[PDB]
Design a protein around this ligand. Structure first.
Ligand SMILES: COc1cc(O)c(/C=C\C(=O)O)cc1[C@@H](O)CC(C)C
Ligand SMILES: [Hg+2]
Ligand SMILES: [Hg+2]
Ligand SMILES: [Zn+2]
Length: 256
């Protein structure tokens, strides 16, 4: 089954998921000199005050922090979005070394990691119905660079020991995702896809310009995770990122 290695990685995904060669695939390179300021974009509203995390899961490719989305709590609206999108989970993509890890790139620059906060459009009733629509999802993308520690990330970091191998989960209630946001909300936005199979083209991407800093010690703990299940040969969970895909004359808009 699909992964990130030589034999099941991004170059292979098209065989089981033909949309891998589609018209609105993610991630993409953000050419800052081609992206245009869009005066018509409303302000972005990120309302994560009443967010309810439930648990953290190693799913064999990354870890998902999952939220209770059975009610309008943590919501994304404004910007390029119409209506309300509900936070369902967040996860990261990261590298084996600080010079790679992000999915989106900025003028070809790769960051050490990238955070994806995944939201589904409430007009569609549930996540499963949302992923059958071109405007079903909104993902908030936040770059990670290595420098000073991110205090709001440390609760995630310390729990990773308990979810080392594929299929392990842990109770992870009362996590506040506001602690992962950079100061500025300037962003780029384009229509795209989820970056893991089935790579559904349902996403309005909102990628923040300002990276957060995490410490080397913090990213190193990400890298101690396992792709394999308990008691199998150890495959370190690293380089779980899909490279940049053809823009196919979509248009990236700047909020600034
Ligand atoms: C919007 O995404 C989701 C929607 C979802 O409904 C679920 C649900 C269950 C679970 O993972 O056990 C997960 C996710 C994420 O877990 C994506 C995963 C392939 C990294
Ligand atoms: Hg997986
Ligand atoms: Hg879709
Ligand atoms: Zn992602």
């Amino acid at each position: 089954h699909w992964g990130y290695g030589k034999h099941n990685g991004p170059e292979h995904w098209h065989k089981d998921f033909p949309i891998a060669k589609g018209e609105r695939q993610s991630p993409v390179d953000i050419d800052t000199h081609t992206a245009k300021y869009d005066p018509s974009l409303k302000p972005l509203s990120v309302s994560y005050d009443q967010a309810t995390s439930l648990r953290i899961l190693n799913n064999g490719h990354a870890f998902n922090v999952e939220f209770d989305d059975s009610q309008d709590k943590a919501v994304l609206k404004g910007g390029p979005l119409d209506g309300t999108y509900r936070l369902i989970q967040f996860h990261f993509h990261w590298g084996s070394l600080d010079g790679q890890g992000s999915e989106h790139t900025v003028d070809k620059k790769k960051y050490a990691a990238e955070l994806h906060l995944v939201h589904w459009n409430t007009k569609y009733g549930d996540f499963g119905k949302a992923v059958q629509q071109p405007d079903g999802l909104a993902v908030l993308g936040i770059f990670l660079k290595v420098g000073s520690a991110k205090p709001g990330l440390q609760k995630v970091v310390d729990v990773l020991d308990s979810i080392k191998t594929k299929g392990k989960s842990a109770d992870f209630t009362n996590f506040d995702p506001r602690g992962l946001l950079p100061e500025s909300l300037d962003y780029w936005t384009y229509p795209g896809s989820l970056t893991t199979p089935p790579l559904l083209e349902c996403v309005t991407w909102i990628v923040l310009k300002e990276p957060i800093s995490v410490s080397s010690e913090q990213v190193l703990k990400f890298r101690k995770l396992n792709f394999n299940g308990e008691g199998e040969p150890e495959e370190l969970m690293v380089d779980n990122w899909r490279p940049a895909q053809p823009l196919k004359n979509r248009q990236i808009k700047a909020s600034f």
